[PDB]
Amino acid sequence: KTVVVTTILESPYVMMKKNHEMLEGNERYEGYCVDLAAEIAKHCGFKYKLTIVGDGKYGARDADTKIWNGMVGELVYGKADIAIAPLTITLVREEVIDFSKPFMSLGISIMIKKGTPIESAEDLSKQTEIAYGTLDSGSTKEFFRRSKIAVFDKMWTYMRSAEPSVFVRTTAEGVARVRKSKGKYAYLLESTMNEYIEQRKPCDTMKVGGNLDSKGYGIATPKGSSLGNAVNLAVLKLNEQGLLDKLKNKWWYDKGEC
Amino acid sequence: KTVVVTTILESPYVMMKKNHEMLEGNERYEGYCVDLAAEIAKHCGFKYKLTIVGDGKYGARDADTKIWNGMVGELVYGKADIAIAPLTITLVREEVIDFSKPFMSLGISIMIKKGTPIESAEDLSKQTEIAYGTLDSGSTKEFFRRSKIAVFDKMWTYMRSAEPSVFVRTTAEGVARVRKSKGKYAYLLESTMNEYIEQRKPCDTMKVGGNLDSKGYGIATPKGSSLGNAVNLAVLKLNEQGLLDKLKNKWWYDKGEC
């Protein structure tokens, strides 16, 4: 059977090709995860169909209904057979879905408009002139919501009650907000997205300070999926062949615009 | 410009829409007070933003710190410009904030699990097999704390010393306690909430006896607010036009499940 793959439109993982309007199916997309999906499918021996997650979210569980949304939800409720995207491996998710060994490393980081007087998370917490927030329904927001570390705990207290809201629906929204806020808004996002954007015109943003944590993205399948085993071994093979590093350079630094 | 409205997640006044995760701002909520807020804003000519009170409380002044919590606190300390919720008009509150004429009438009442051998407050006060309590923080608890009426004084003497605590953090907690206590717990709450729950599945609770008092909910604003006058006139207009009665029937009886 054709494997239904759920993914998300997030640069440079999955993007619509310039002339996508004249293309069909998987050919409409390009990006790191588009290339990865092709490789994984080749090694695991399956045909597939790329589908963009319906609600455009990564995945979080509603505290009241306990219902999962995003790509995680699509796997949990059987709408998709596998998720190939920058989906962060976390404990709460590992409890409802399966993850392959990580194919990419990352950590939460800070994105600022060049010139912004901020060098670290500690800096953001000690002031209020510069607003800062995170993405919604993702692992970064959860990180702050559950952090016991003084600095991060203080930051969350601020963000959760900030008005207007400092949270954004998509990474694109967060980046645009930083670029138009004349340095009055800093965005907390994964180092991977941060470093990609830093190399794209108008080259007005930059990553500052060290990462807040160390984790990784994994290919996810529904609990007990028969694809889990093969997918995991495929990720290990691709990493050892140097293919993952090749794809990283291809989409991040190769063709950089700055 | 945009008026910050503080309210509380209390059914059927303000509730999260089933699909709130895919909606934004004021569209995330539904209920009697959500409908009323839109009308008050339309008639007073202002844009607004609904916000759920941070500590999930109605409002009481801490003995010692003298600090106000809940929605009252949000108004007193300037976090919100107006409160549109089932906020009871009381003397201690009228001393620090302004209230519009009442938009809904209510009285403290008794909620029992069907079959409970209780028909009045006097009944509760003359026995001990059936425990009873109130919302841990609110106008009801204060009613008993300050009452000089024998029956109620007797009830307060019992409740304030009962162990384990007979007080609850939210109305929902109280309702759940009544439903799971096999008739060994009765809950004292405002007639409005009582009558609402009476029409909700599993239809295992009911309001018994007459109300202990007679009062009302009012729209509150910070002392001296420029919004006070128009808001008051809007409440009077909406009541005279029959809107308030229409909204109560809509959220209490038209959608009754019993």
Place this chain on the structure above:
Amino acid sequence: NKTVVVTTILESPYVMMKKNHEMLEGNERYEGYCVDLAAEIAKHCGFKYKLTIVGDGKYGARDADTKIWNGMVGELVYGKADIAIAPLTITLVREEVIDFSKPFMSLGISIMIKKGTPIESAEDLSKQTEIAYGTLDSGSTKEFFRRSKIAVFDKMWTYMRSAEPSVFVRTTAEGVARVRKSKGKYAYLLESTMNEYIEQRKPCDTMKVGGNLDSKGYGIATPKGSSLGNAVNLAVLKLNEQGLLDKLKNKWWYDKGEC
């Protein structure tokens, strides 16, 4: 030559966000009758353009107090846009402040009901109170009822202006959703063009009833004294005569039919 700023409004099937295009850029994000019309007008007039969605999401009305114009009309009046290409109704109060091309589409105010609603005309609505009814805010339909001297419409306005809760809605989508969730207790007054479009969209539970209450048209608008006015007007006439407008109507209304 400079890039012409086009103001329009998100109203189906005139201008709609293509599925999953929220994060893309430029005119490629949108599709619809007015998107296709803009392309043809620009081609015939020889100009480059940028589609922008009206900031306040309104068509355009003048506030009685401040006398300030909002919506697409306002964007033209205050110089925020160079032209409006949308389902903007040609009206006297508007033509007094902006210029309109000859109409590119005909329409009339009509009634939308949830299937099964016992209403067949405006007269019917006016002679009962069980079923509520209203219109869009800040638009030509509301103004039509506000100024009407016709017995039936005057009675309808008297009712709508003070009905509680408000019978008016912020967007066409809101009015449509209200009809659909009201179990026949709400009827929506809107332009026949939108009515006929929705009637062919799932869940296919609404329908237009009775004849139109008036007859008017949508026009492409430009600020007074705009150097684009003349060419745009002639372009509209050419598009009509070439059968292009009829082709676009069929493409977005009937060929798209889901019922």
